[PDB]
Design a protein around this ligand. Structure first.
Ligand SMILES: [Mg+2]
Ligand SMILES: [Mg+2]
Ligand SMILES: [Mg+2]
Ligand SMILES: [Mg+2]
Ligand SMILES: [Mg+2]
Ligand SMILES: [Mg+2]
Ligand SMILES: [Mg+2]
Ligand SMILES: [Mg+2]
Ligand SMILES: [Mg+2]
Ligand SMILES: [Zn+2]
Lengths: 136, 134, 94, 125, 38
RNA sequence: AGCCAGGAUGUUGGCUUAGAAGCAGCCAUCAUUUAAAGAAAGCGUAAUAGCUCACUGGUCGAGUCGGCCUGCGCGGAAGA
């Protein structure tokens, strides 16, 4: 379950998720799963999904994961008042803007890939579509 | 109207023959020993196919046909069992003369136009069980 | 062979472009060579179904502008982020 | 399925064996096993006979290739044609005994010399 | 009667229908495929 | 789309199994007569047999198939 080996700082500003994505195109595989909607991907989500589409291909072809959960989220536990600092680090997320490419794939029949990606997207919080790499 | 594949001079065990065509009204021992009297000429150890034809009066007429493509390819390559992994693992060999002998036996037993059509159907059964044609 | 019909753009900027895109038309450009650049507009559909072939990118096509053809190649093309759409095309004089 | 090119080539093959053939017999193919049909295909390659089951509106296009055009009303109903490229007869003598052997289908109308022969007079061939 | 908010064809004999503004899935073959939306 | 017809030989392909015969499982999946017929898409057997399908000929007679992009609606939808 992905997570930065080591970081400069332990915690982060909530920040915003605004504007559109970079890496709109499929640069490695023949096919890719692109995100239409905008949202935060926990590492758990990405892992579960990668699993789903790994079962789906019977471990053939190849799978890239283009997104990384590099920003730490915190939570104060239950029954704790406000203040007294910033909450402890719960988990990691990747900010996703419309038009990012979450996974790439190739070495597989197209039909099968659309399938595997449907099964992968069942595990994801955000609106997604199927896409093909193009010439230029 | 039934079919079985029975070893050369053999008949009347319980699981292979007796019940199968015995629930159809057929007398079991006349089939058994007129089939061992006909197929006494087939070599020991080859299953030979027999087509049993039953009529409303239970008197039957069977055409014993020539041994299978797979059995004559077991014997013409010398082997016992063919491949469990055909054309991946290859278990024996036959020159085109054995393809043509097995396909004269089966020239009596095929739908083929020429001995090249019967040699090609025995070619097909030669690629089925893994055997090499050389 | 691909033939694209086009009109000369009387306007420019973000506003012009987004009114273009609302009307189911889209802006593109023709540069390269001794000449000056020529900004033109196209029908989104025709071209979207035309670049739905591969050769579109490897070949010399023609563009009909005010009675006058130019022969060009496809240089680079920016697509809308998630939509089956085209924001723009760089045409380089062939 | 069959593309227009497919149909065109096949019309060319039926028209091509039709030009080369001495005599033909059109028949009903319905209600008979592929066992007895491969039996009349063996009895076919043995008699020199070219056996076919071909589309009707395809055989109007191939038989427009002359002089079998008297057969274009014999193409209503399922069509199995026997062209004897070697000898005339041996189709018309083989089919009546195959249809009396099976007692299925029909064997409707023949063609020879450029004329059609009605079903009870195919005993001419 | 599987009653749920996602209803599908579970084989080739399942046929979708809208009766009285409900989407159901009806099978001739397999009583177990009988579904209603809800 | 419907309705009539056929869905063949080698062969029960070999492996394996008390049995696997298109249809436990493993591997190949060729060739023949072909209008067409997967070494078979499902029910079926102790294993067969038995039943449709893929595929093709017939009858029919002019439009039909399913994606893409969007507009408005349906279900998803329970509380004092
Ligand atoms: Mg800021
Ligand atoms: Mg950036
Ligand atoms: Mg300005
Ligand atoms: Mg503005
Ligand atoms: Mg009611
Ligand atoms: Mg139809
Ligand atoms: Mg249309
Ligand atoms: Mg509602
Ligand atoms: Mg309720
Ligand atoms: Zn069903």
């Amino acid at each position: 379950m992905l997570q930065p080996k080591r970081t400069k700082f332990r915690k982060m500003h909530k920040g915003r998720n605004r504007g559109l994505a970079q890496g709109t195109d499929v640069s490695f595989g023949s096919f890719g799963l692109k995100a239409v909607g905008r949202g935060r991907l926990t590492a758990r989500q990405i892992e579960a999904a990668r699993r789903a589409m790994t079962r789906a291909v019977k471990r053939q072809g190849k799978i890239w994961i283009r997104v990384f959960p590099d920003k730490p989220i915190t939570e104060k536990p239950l029954a704790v008042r406000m203040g007294k600092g910033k909450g402890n680090v719960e988990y990691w997320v990747a900010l996703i803007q419309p038009g990012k490419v979450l996974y790439e794939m190739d070495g597989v029949p197209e039909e099968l890939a659309r399938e595997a990606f449907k099964l992968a997207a069942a595990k994801l919080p955000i609106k997604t579509t199927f896409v093909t790499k193009t010439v230029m | 109207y039934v079919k079985l594949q029975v070893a050369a001079g053999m008949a009347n065990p319980s699981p292979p023959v007796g019940p199968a065509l015995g629930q159809q009204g057929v007398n079991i021992m006349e089939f058994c020993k007129a089939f061992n009297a006909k197929t006494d000429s087939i070599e020991k150890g080859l299953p030979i196919p027999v087509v049993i034809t039953v009529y409303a009066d239970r008197s039957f007429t069977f055409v014993t046909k020539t041994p299978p493509a797979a059995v004559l390819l077991k014997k013409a390559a010398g082997i016992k069992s063919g491949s469990g992994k055909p054309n991946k693992d290859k278990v024996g060999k036959i020159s085109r003369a054995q393809l043509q002998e097995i396909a004269q036996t089966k020239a009596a037993d095929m739908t083929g136009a020429d001995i090249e059509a019967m040699t090609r159907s025995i070619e097909g059964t030669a690629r089925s069980m893994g055997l090499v044609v050389e | 062979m691909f033939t694209i019909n086009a009109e000369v753009r009387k306007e420019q900027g973000k506003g012009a472009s987004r009114r273009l895109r609302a009307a189911n038309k889209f802006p593109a450009i023709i540069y390269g060579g001794k000449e000056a650049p020529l900004a033109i507009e196209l029908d989104h559909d025709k071209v979207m179904n035309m670049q739905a072939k591969a050769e579109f990118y490897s070949e010399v096509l023609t563009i009909v502008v005010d009675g006058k053809e130019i022969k060009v190649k496809a240089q680079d093309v920016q697509r809308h982020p998630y939509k089956p759409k085209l924001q723009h095309i760089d045409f380089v004089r062939a | 399925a069959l593309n227009l090119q497919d149909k065109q080539a096949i019309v060319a093959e039926v028209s091509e064996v039709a030009k080369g053939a001495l005599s033909a017999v059109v028949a009903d193919s319905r209600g008979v096993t592929v066992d007895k049909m491969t039996e009349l295909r063996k009895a076919g390659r043995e008699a020199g006979v070219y056996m076919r089951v071909v589309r009707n509106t395809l055989l109007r296009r191939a038989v427009e290739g002359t002089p079998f055009e008297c057969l274009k009303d014999a193409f209503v109903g399922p069509t199995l044609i026997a062209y004897v490229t070697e000898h005339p007869g041996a189709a018309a003598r083989l089919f009546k005994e195959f249809a009396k052997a099976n007692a299925k289908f029909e064997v409707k109308a023949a063609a020879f010399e450029g004329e059609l022969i009605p079903a009870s007079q195919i005993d001419r061939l | 009667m599987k009653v749920r908010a996602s209803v599908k064809k579970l084989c080739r004999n399942c046929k979708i229908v809208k009766r009285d503004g409900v989407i159901r899935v009806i099978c001739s073959a397999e009583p177990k495929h009988k579904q209603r939306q809800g």
